Amino acid sequence: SGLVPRGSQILCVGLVVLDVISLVDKYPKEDSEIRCLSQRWQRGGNASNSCTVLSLLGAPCAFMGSMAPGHVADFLVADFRRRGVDVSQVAWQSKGDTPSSCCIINNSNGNRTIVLHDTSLPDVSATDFEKVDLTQFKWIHIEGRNASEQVKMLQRIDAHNTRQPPEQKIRVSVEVEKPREELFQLFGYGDVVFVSKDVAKHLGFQSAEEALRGLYGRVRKGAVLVCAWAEEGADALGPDGKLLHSDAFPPPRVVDTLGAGDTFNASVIFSLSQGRSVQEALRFGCQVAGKKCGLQGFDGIV
Amino acid sequence: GSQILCVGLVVLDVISLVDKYPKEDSEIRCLSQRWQRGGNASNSCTVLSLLGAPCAFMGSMAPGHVADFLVADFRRRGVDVSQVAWQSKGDTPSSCCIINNSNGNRTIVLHDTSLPDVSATDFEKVDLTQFKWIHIEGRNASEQVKMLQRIDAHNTRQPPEQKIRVSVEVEKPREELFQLFGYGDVVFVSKDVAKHLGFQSAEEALRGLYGRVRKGAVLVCAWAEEGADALGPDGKLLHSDAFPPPRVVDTLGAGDTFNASVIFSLSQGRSVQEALRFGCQVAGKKCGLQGFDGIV
Ligand SMILES: Cc1c[nH]c2ncnc(N3CCC[C@@H](CO)C3)c12
Ligand SMILES: Cc1c[nH]c2ncnc(N3CCC[C@@H](CO)C3)c12
Ligand SMILES: Cc1c[nH]c2ncnc(N3CCC[C@@H](CO)C3)c12
Numbered sequence: 163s164g165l166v167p168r169g170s171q172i173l174c175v176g177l178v179v180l181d182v183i184s185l186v187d188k189y190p191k192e193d194s195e196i197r198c199l200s201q202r203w204q205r206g207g208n209a210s211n212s213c214t215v216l217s218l219l220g221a222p223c224a225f226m227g228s229m230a231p232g233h234v235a236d237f238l239v240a241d242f243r244r245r246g247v248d249v250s251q252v253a254w255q256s257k258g259d260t261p262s263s264c265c266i267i268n269n270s271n272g273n274r275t276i277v278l279h280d281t282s283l284p285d286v287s288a289t290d291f292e293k294v295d296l297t298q299f300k301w302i303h304i305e306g307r308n309a310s311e312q313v314k315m316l317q318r319i320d321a322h323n324t325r326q327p328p329e330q331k332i333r334v335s336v337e338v339e340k341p342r343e344e345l346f347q348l349f350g351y352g353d354v355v356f357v358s359k360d361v362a363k364h365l366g367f368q369s370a371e372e373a374l375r376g377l378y379g380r381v382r383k384g385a386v387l388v389c390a391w392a393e394e395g396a397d398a399l400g401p402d403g404k405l406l407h408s409d410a411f412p413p414p415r416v417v418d419t420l421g422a423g424d425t426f427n428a429s430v431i432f433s434l435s436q437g438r439s440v441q442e443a444l445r446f447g448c449q450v451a452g453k454k455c456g457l458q459g460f461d462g463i464v
Numbered sequence: 465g466s467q468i469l470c471v472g473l474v475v476l477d478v479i480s481l482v483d484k485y486p487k488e489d490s491e492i493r494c495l496s497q498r499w500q501r502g503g504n505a506s507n508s509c510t511v512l513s514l515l516g517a518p519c520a521f522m523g524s525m526a527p528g529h530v531a532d533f534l535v536a537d538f539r540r541r542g543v544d545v546s547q548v549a550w551q552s553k554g555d556t557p558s559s560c561c562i563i564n565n566s567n568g569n570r571t572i573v574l575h576d577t578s579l580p581d582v583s584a585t586d587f588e589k590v591d592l593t594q595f596k597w598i599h600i601e602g603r604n605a606s607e608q609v610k611m612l613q614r615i616d617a618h619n620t621r622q623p624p625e626q627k628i629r630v631s632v633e634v635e636k637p638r639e640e641l642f643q644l645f646g647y648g649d650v651v652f653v654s655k656d657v658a659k660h661l662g663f664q665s666a667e668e669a670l671r672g673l674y675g676r677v678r679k680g681a682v683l684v685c686a687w688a689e690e691g692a693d694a695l696g697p698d699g700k701l702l703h704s705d706a707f708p709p710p711r712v713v714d715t716l717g718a719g720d721t722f723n724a725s726v727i728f729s730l731s732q733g734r735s736v737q738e739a740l741r742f743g744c745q746v747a748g749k750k751c752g753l754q755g756f757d758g759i760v
Contacts, residue, residue, distance in 0.1 A: 182478055184560055184573045189488045192562075193569045201558070201575035233499050236529055262497065264480055264560045266573065273489040277480045277562065279497040 413456020
C-alpha cells in the first residue's frame with residue numbers, strides 16, 4: 163500500500179462474489195459428464211462491479227467488503243488488481259469462505275440455473291468502519307445491506323464533514339437495491355440515493371416518476387433521489403422539485419445485463435464527482451450502462 | 465522400475481454438494497463447496513499414493529495460481545510431477561461439479577481450455593527405466609498409440625523380469641479411442657462405452673469386446689453397484705460383487721479409484737480375481753466418503 167493523496171479516492175462499501183458461469187447446449191442430465199460451450203470466472207457484487215467501472219472511467223477507487231482467506235479470495239483479489247481497484251480496506255474474516263456461485267446458462271432457452279455458496283461471512287461493521295482514516299476519500303458509496311451498522315457509518319461520515327471546509331467535505335451515496343424493510347431507513351442518509359426498479363415495484367410503484375414522487379419525502383434535505391428503469395431510461399429528483407429524465411441508450415443487441423445497474427450507479431457517481439450537473443450525470447449513466455448491455459463483461463464500456 | 469505412471473488429465477474440480485439435484489431455472493443454496501484436484505489419471509495417482517505406491521503423473525499444465533494449487537496438492541500426496549508437460553500458452557481446465565448428497569450422483573460440466581494434449585514427442589523424452597507400470601487415460605488416440613508402441617519396443621529389449629506392464633482406459637464413447645483396445649496388458653472399459661455399443665451387462669460386453677484386445681491381455685469392465693467383471697486369455701469370466709456403502713454420498717472419482725486399485729493389486733502380484741475384488745472394495749469405500757481421504 164502506497165501513499166494515497168488526500169481527497170482522491172471513491173470508496174464503495176458492499177459485497178463481492180465469484181461467479182463461475184458455464185454456457186451449455188442443453189441442461190445437463192444428472193450423473194453425466196459434459197463439455198460446456200464456454201466458461202467464465204467473473205468477479206461480481208454491486209460495490210465490486212461499481213469499482214471496476216470507476217477504474218475504467220479513470221477514477222482512483224477502493225473496495226471495502228468482507229472476504230475470507232482462501233482460493234476464491236485469491237482469484238478475486240487478483241481480479242480487483244487486474245481492474246486497478248485498491249483492496250487495502252478489505253475486512254478480512256478469520257473464519258468462513260468468500261461467497262461464490264456456479265451458474266449454468268442453457269443456450270437453447272436462455273434459462274439461468276444457480277447454485278449459491280454462502281457461509282454467512284460477517285458483514286462490514288461500524289467498528290470495522292471507525293478504524294478507517296477517511297481523509298483519502300472524496301466520495302463514499304454504500305450498498306445497502308446491514309442497515310443499523312451502515313447508519314453508524316453514515317453518522318461517522320456526517321461528523322467528519324461538520325469539521326471540514328466545503329471543498330474538503332466527503333460526498334455520500336447509498337443504494338437501496340433489495341426490497342427488505344430494514345434498508346428503508348437508508349433513504350434518510352446520503353447526498354445521492356439510488357433506488358432500484360425492483361424495490362420501487364415491490365413498494366407498489368409502476369414507473370420511475372411514481373417512485374421518485376412517492377419516496378422523496380423519505381430523503382434527507384437537499385438530497386437527490388435516482389431511479390433507473392431499464393429500457394425506459396432513468397429519472398432523478400432534487401430539492402427544487404423538478405423531475406429530471408434521460409432516455410435509455412439501448413445497444414444494437416442486448417448481450418449482457420449483469421451488472422448494468424452497477425455501471426449506471428458508478429457512472430452517475432463519477433459524473434457528479436467531476437462537478438457535472440444531475441441532468442448531465444443521468445445522461446452519462448444511461449449512456450455507459452446502455453453501452454455495457456451490448457458487451458460481455460466490462461471491457462469496452464469506455 | 466519402482467514407480468507407476470499415469471498419463472492423462474489434471475483438472476480443477478469446483479464441487480458443490482447439494483441435497484437434491486437442481487431443477488432448471490432455479491436458484492439454490494448448496495450444503496458445502498470445495499476445490500478438488502480432478503482428472504482421471506490425476507485421481508488414479510491420488511489413490512495409488514494413498515495405497516502406498518510410488519507414482520508419477522504426466523499431463524499438460526499451464527502456469528498460474530490454479531496450477532500452483534494442483535501442483536502443491538500433487539506434492540502434498542507425494543505424486544511425482546517431474547514429467548508434467550508445462551505449457552506457455554493456454555489456461556488450466558476446470559469443471560463445475562454437482563454432487564447429490566441423497567444418492568452420491570455426480571454431474572460434471574467440463575471446460576476444455578484447448579491446452580495442447582501430451583504428444584508422442586513429449587513421451588519420447590520420458591526415461592522409461594524408472595517405471596514398473598504405465599497407465600494411459602485415453603484422449604488423443606493416434607499420439608497415445610505411438611507412446612504404447614514406444615513402451616512395446618522398450619519391452620522387446622528387456623528380460624521378462626524388467627518388462628513394463630501397460631494399462632489402458634477407454635472411458636469416453638468416442639470412436640477414435642477404440643483403437644487403444646488394442647494395446648496393453650490390462651484394458652479398462654467403462655459401462656458408458658459398453659452401453660453405447662449395445663451391451664446390457666459387463667459379461668456381455670466382455671464376450672463382445674474380447675476380440676479387440678492384444679494376445680494375453682485382460683479386459684476389465686466395472687458396472688457400478690452390479691460390481692465388476694474381467695476376462696483373460698483362458699476364456700474364464702471373473703466376477704466381483706460391489707462393496708456398496710450403506711449411504712452412497714460421493715461417486716466422483718469412484719471409477720478412477722477402481723482403476724488405480726486394480727492396477728495396484730495386479731502390480732503387487734495378486735490374481736485378476738483378487739485385484740477385481742480389491743478394486744470393488746476400495747471404490748465402494750470411496751463412494752461413502754467425500755473426496756479420497758479415509759479409503760485406506
Ligand atoms: C491479499 C490477501 C489475501 N489474504 C489476506 N489475508 C490477510 N491480509 C491480506 N493482505 C496482506 C497484504 C496486504 C493487504 C492487501 O492489500 C492484505 C491478504
Ligand atoms: C439500456 C438498456 C437496454 N436494456 C436494458 N435492460 C436492463 N437495464 C438496462 N439498463 C441498465 C440499468 C440502467 C438503465 C438506464 O437506461 C439501462 C437496459
Ligand atoms: C459400489 C458402488 C455403489 N454405488 C456406486 N455407484 C457408482 N459406482 C460404484 N462403484 C465405483 C466404480 C466401480 C464399481 C465397482 O464395480 C463400484 C458404486
